[PDB]
Design a protein around this ligand. Structure first.
Ligand code: AGS
Ligand code: AGS
Ligand code: AGS
Ligand code: AGS
Ligand code: MG
Ligand code: MG
Ligand code: MG
Ligand code: MG
Lengths: 731, 731
């Protein structure tokens, strides 16, 4: 699997956190059989490994009420490891823990507000009375005393980082008290759990970055060289910088961060000095990561660049990238939202040759993002994040963070009648009551302008075969053309046939060509890329479409509305010839399928049909009576149709209708039902100051206005091309 | 021959390595007749020359069990020469070897891990006890002693580089111990054996570079001046830098390396200083090579350049190139992947006038690359590198190195369930078991995006006359037009006729024009360049195509789908007029053949047909019955067709079918067989929870759906142009 690196090892050292019974900050309880397997004894000091490299040293005890697979700890231990209930930790024996020489501690500010008592005497001394509590640098623990308990932070240890607080150890609380904001900033460090919708890409990053650095011998043994340069790219706001901070906070390697604007804001000469210093300091620390965020800020195309300093930065960076000895254990990551603006010399072998695409999240990916962002918001109980994830079509992670911000602001606007902008301090009874409801999310949805609306979406469609009425033969052909070479490639090797990767749908308008392309991509669970003819004529970029379909294989590359390009024949001639050239180079990829659709088969370019490009000509015809019943059933699945409606009769009397004409009939019936329902409630309001389902009368009224969208002469010509389209090339 | 310089001289001094019997690190055994021919005696110290200029001094002995053509040595001697079993060395008498004054040695780190004993006393003294072992600087030898033997490196010799370790010689092991990584980096130096698919180009480089430098008198005697500038060019990743390191590590000349980005990363003034210093230091060392890697980094087109410093670098380089006295014995090599971005003044006589094209490797060349890269990988036994070489179509050497990396990573992913990313050290039982299987290579193939897919391939096609059915007369014409002027030029001089270098294939679509062009290029063993019409209309660059066909002569330059250009008549007018101009200038090359194909002969530009451009008009017609049998046989060669299938009957009932229509019939039959086979196995799985060959029923079902791709009126018009196409020019 591609995500095997992210899988939990499920070792016995892994344990699940539980709610403590009597265990204080410095002890943890386990089941006795667990120590028997782990050979742990009583009174042993143990080391806990958690999230974001956080550590803790505590005492392991025996619990007869502890589960085998779980560990016992209080909320303080759960806090110090950045772990939560239900999360997994690791445990290992901790030897060589010596008595503390001197521990430097300090309290949290908001705990010692208004308190003038001696912190050491009143709080620290009783808590450290012969208990032999093991502590580590950076730990936070709650100490009772006085009217209110105060938390303290271990800022320095003698020795570091583990020590035992003996009664002979010197405990001192001098120094500037620790602000809660300082600990709060460290509490909310980014981790791999703060990225949603990037599970596959996070697996790639771990293999490319964390594996060659933690286990360089694993690559020397298999006799391969790991990459030195990783280029994260994607649209703006998709979380490349967020992944940078996640790797910064959850890697064992030394991490150096370079900002593009930071480097180029410096004078001519301090930029190169800072670049050289970054790579030098990364080589001094053996396993290191250099992240160059906004790579295209410092390394644009040398052909398209005016200043001398910009060109000297790019050459300096190329030199430093080439100067990595491959024995230095330095990996250079970079992020960019304009991957094609980067100097081509920086994307070669040995320099940023591996690329990770942090693309647009899909509906489930962006539901995961929404849960991450709302995880600390005060949500109401009626808010359905699954729904919000479904309407947020063109949103990226930053668009969803902005959407949650706007929802919170709408919630505040509903409470401004209770607050004032000029209060010295806000009311206390409005904070606890302040919650974001699903209505605020609907409002924020109506006002959000996504930044990723105008760019190609590559995802499995939700259109299913059940959305299509009839075309059972075409469904069989499409399965045998798109699914068999992908699912049973050995069959195609047995008979020596190579599969054809192209299909042309043609026929009258509104008969289901677009639905068929999406439905076959959905059944095969293949990514779907749709490029309408108008999008091509308003566009170098055809090359990016085919490259995008190559990266996302198995893919169905749909070229819809080819008739729009054909009518434009100029720019349309270049577009078609580019597409033909790409389809010739595309034959290598055995799992990218190209589909074209046109309802003007008389003007299609004959070269499109050459054996090897789109030689499978499938004719989607105007639906017959049985298919019309099926179309009407398929369109009305989401509608409450009353049982007296005879779809058999509706399909009998609509003779030359398309699938889209039948959809328009159902649309009119819903419009009549909505009008009747709206009139009914206005009449009720009129008297005070119904229409649950679409009935047969609505379909009668809607159908006497039915207009047939394909002429009889049109049907004749389409039937003629059903026989003579393969002959269109030649004369 | 063009590769005569690479041929082994097969001198008596050449010997084949053998597995030692009793020979230790300082002795080598030979057959007694070999010394009789070589006049070598017993106890003589001898010098061994191996790969990458490595040397060794040892003692020659007499072996009655040694072959005449082979030499005896242990693994230590085999290691010190960078030679392997089956490889050839050279031998010569070594006189004037004096006693050592002081030899500075040091051990390898991993050999002395955990060992605190005295290296000299325990190891070095017993091994050097009166044995009079001859040693050289940089030698590595294994010395027994203690619980574990330790290897030592000779870092300095008094005198250098040969010395005799007398008992009176001072042996000392002080100094920082030698890391194995340091020796490992020197072990894996690049040599001419680390380049695959460039045998012809390596021969060119040796003649242009290593011959004028080793034997300048050989050029003064024949009265010619050797070139001073060699330009390696090719697509990115094709191994130009690799050849640079190979020449650096396997030439007797002083080698200076200049990096384009290195030079231009310096300040305005240190760049010119570094260039001048490089050429000065190359002239101080008499036979020298200056390699300027990434030439286009420092020397772009002065017309297309903005900075003043860039233009001063180009002028500085032109001055230095012109300043080579031709008596300095300095050769300047350069590499570039944009040979047309270089200043035209640098490709003139006396400056980079010789060019070597490190092009795309072909199937056998890239099999050689794959063997080089996997030679230290742990491959399984089922991996077929010949197959991988066949699917990797658009790959260059760097794409194949990346492909082997991805295969190794897939192998690791299959073993992550046994390893952990957080282990302090990896498991030992998973390394030895970790091997790359052919399944990992198929996966890496499915994910590889080659960088050389979108560029012209120049190679001999695999299409053979047996792939074509019928057209026996056309095959005779093509042989008499393409093969006779190449194979029997004296015949064409006898009769005073000059051959015509152009052919126009025309006729109905799908009748074999593309196959005929590839088949004649394959029979003549000529390079084949194909330029489809769409590729031209999406493109200065026509000039590069004809230049590329001129460099690769004997070549068949195929202009396929000329009908696509004709229908576009603009950009198409410029393309045709450019092609016509090139065909006029192309008549000089007597061994570049141009072929055009069109299935719209009614709109071909009449100037194409002028006597001297494409005046040979060959009409490929719609196949007759006998040819249809031949086409069906040719298409089904790779398919398991059952014997009851009557191809004679199939061809009888398909009357007006093209070659491509018959191929489509065979494709449908294979699709029906695949569907039946897939249904059969699903039925077997259905009952548990066949179709070995295509039978006559499949061809019956497939043929009732057969559609004829050429109309009867189309056939009439094509037959009319079979008589009146030469008349198309004039009115
Ligand atoms: N995949 C994601 N998961 C969770 N939060 C995300 C994700 N992507 C974006 N966000 C949020 O959006 C914010 C902005 O994302 P960034 O990390 O700046 O994206 P970006 O790749 O840097 O885009 P740029 O810098 O404009 S090219 C982050 O701080 C997160 O709060
Ligand atoms: N066979 C069908 N089954 C169900 N709904 C259909 C069918 N054909 C058309 N429709 C409906 O009519 C709409 C027309 O879209 P399609 O027919 O898939 O695209 P089309 O064939 O290119 O025709 P266009 O887009 O109007 S030119 C669909 O979105 C459906 O709502
Ligand atoms: N012909 C070849 N034989 C063997 N290995 C090769 C060959 N070509 C490339 N490689 C491998 O691929 C790597 C990349 O080759 P390079 O030397 O970078 O090619 P290149 O010509 O320098 O391309 P540039 O520098 O981007 S223009 C080499 O280090 C080898 O490991
Ligand atoms: N005479 C033939 N013998 C064998 N196979 C043939 C023959 N003619 C056509 N084919 C098959 O049909 C395919 C069509 O390719 P060609 O006929 O060589 O190209 P063409 O003549 O330019 O016609 P196109 O490419 O369809 S416009 C070939 O790749 C073969 O698979
Ligand atoms: Mg950013
Ligand atoms: Mg549509
Ligand atoms: Mg290079
Ligand atoms: Mg062809």
């Amino acid at each position: 699997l591609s995500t095997a690196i992210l899988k939990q090892k499920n070792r016995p050292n892994r344990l699940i956190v539980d709610e403590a019974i009597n265990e204080d900050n410095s002890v943890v309880s386990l089941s006795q059989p667990k120590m028997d397997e782990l050979q742990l004894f009583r009174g042993d000091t143990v080391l806990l490994k958690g999230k974001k490299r956080r550590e803790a040293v505590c005492i392991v005890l025996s619990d007869d009420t502890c589960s085998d697979e779980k560990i016992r700890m209080n909320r303080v231990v759960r806090n110090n490891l950045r772990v939560r209930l239900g999360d997994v930790i690791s445990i290992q024996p901790c030897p060589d823990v010596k008595y503390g020489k001197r521990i430097h501690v300090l309290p949290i500010d908001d705990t010692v507000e208004g308190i003038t008592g001696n912190l050491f005497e009143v709080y620290l001394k009783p808590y450290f009375l012969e208990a032999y509590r093991p502590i580590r640098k950076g730990d936070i623990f709650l100490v009772r005393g006085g009217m209110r308990a105060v938390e303290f932070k271990v800022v320095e240890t003698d020795p570091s980082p583990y020590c035992i607080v003996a009664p002979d150890t010197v405990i001192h609380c001098e120094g500037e008290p620790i602000k809660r904001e300082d600990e709060e900033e460290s509490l909310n460090e980014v981790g791999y759990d703060d990225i949603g919708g990037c599970r596959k890409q996070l697996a790639q990053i771990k293999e490319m970055v964390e594996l060659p650095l933690r286990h360089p011998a694993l690559f020397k043994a298999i006799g391969v060289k790991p990459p030195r340069g990783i280029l994260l790219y994607g649209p703006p706001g998709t979380g490349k910088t967020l992944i940078a901070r996640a790797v910064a906070n959850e890697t064992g390697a030394f991490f150096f961060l370079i900002n593009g604007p930071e480097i180029m804001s410096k004078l001519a000469g301090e930029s190169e000095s800072n670049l050289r210093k970054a790579f030098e300091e990364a080589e001094k620390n053996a396993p290191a990561i250099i992240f160059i965020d906004e790579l295209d800020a410092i390394a644009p195309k040398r052909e398209k660049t005016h200043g001398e300093v910009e060109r000297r930065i790019v050459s300096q960076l190329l030199t430093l990238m080439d100067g990595l000895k491959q024995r230095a254990h330095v990996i250079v990551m970079a992020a960019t939202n304009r991957p094609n603006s980067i100097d081509p010399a920086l994307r070669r072998f040995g320099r940023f040759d591996r690329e990770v695409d942090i693309g647009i999240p899909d509906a489930t990916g962006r539901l995961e993002i929404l849960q991450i962002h709302t995880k600390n918001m005060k949500l109401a109980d009626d808010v359905d994040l699954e729904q919000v994830a479904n309407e947020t079509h063109g949103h990226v992670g930053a668009d969803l963070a902005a959407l949650c911000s706007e929802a919170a602001l709408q919630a505040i606007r509903k409470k401004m009648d209770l607050i004032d902008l000029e209060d010295e301090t806000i009311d206390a009874e409005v904070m606890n009551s302040l919650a974001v409801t699903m209505d605020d999310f609907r409002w924020a949805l109506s006002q959000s302008n996504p930044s990723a609306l105008r760019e190609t979406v590559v995802e499995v469609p939700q259109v299913t075969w059940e959305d299509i009425g009839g075309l059972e033969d075409v469904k069989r052909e499409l399965q045998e053309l798109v699914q068999y070479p992908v699912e049973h490639p050995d069959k195609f090797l047995k008979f020596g046939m190579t599969p054809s990767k192209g299909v042309l749908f043609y026929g009258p308008p509104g008969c289901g060509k677009t639905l068929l392309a999406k439905a076959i991509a959905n059944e095969c669970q293949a990514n779907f890329i749709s490029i309408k003819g108008p999008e091509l004529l308003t566009m170098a970029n055809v090359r990016e479409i085919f490259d995008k379909a190559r990266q996302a294989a198995p893919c169905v590359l749909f070229f819809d509305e080819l008739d729009s390009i054909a009518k434009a024949r100029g720019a349309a001639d270049r577009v078609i010839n580019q597409i033909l050239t790409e389809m010739d180079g595309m034959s290598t990829k055995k799992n990218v399928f190209i589909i074209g659709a046109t309802n003007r088969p008389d003007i299609i370019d004959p070269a499109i049909l050459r054996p090897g490009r789109l030689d499978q000509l499938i004719y989607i015809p105007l639906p017959d009576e049985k298919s019309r019943v099926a179309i009407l059933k398929a369109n009305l699945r989401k509608s409450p149709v009353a049982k007296d409606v005879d779809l058999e009769f509706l399909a009998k009397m609509t003779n030359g209708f398309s699938g889209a004409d039948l959809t328009e009939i159902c649309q009119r019936a819903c419009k009549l039902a909505i009008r009747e329902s709206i009139e009914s409630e206005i009449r009720r309001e009129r008297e005070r100051q119904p229409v649950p389902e679409i009935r047969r009368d609505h379909f009668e009224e809607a159908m006497r206005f039915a207009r047939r969208s394909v002429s009889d002469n049109d049907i004749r010509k389409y039937e003629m091309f059903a026989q003579t389209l393969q002959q269109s090339r030649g004369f």
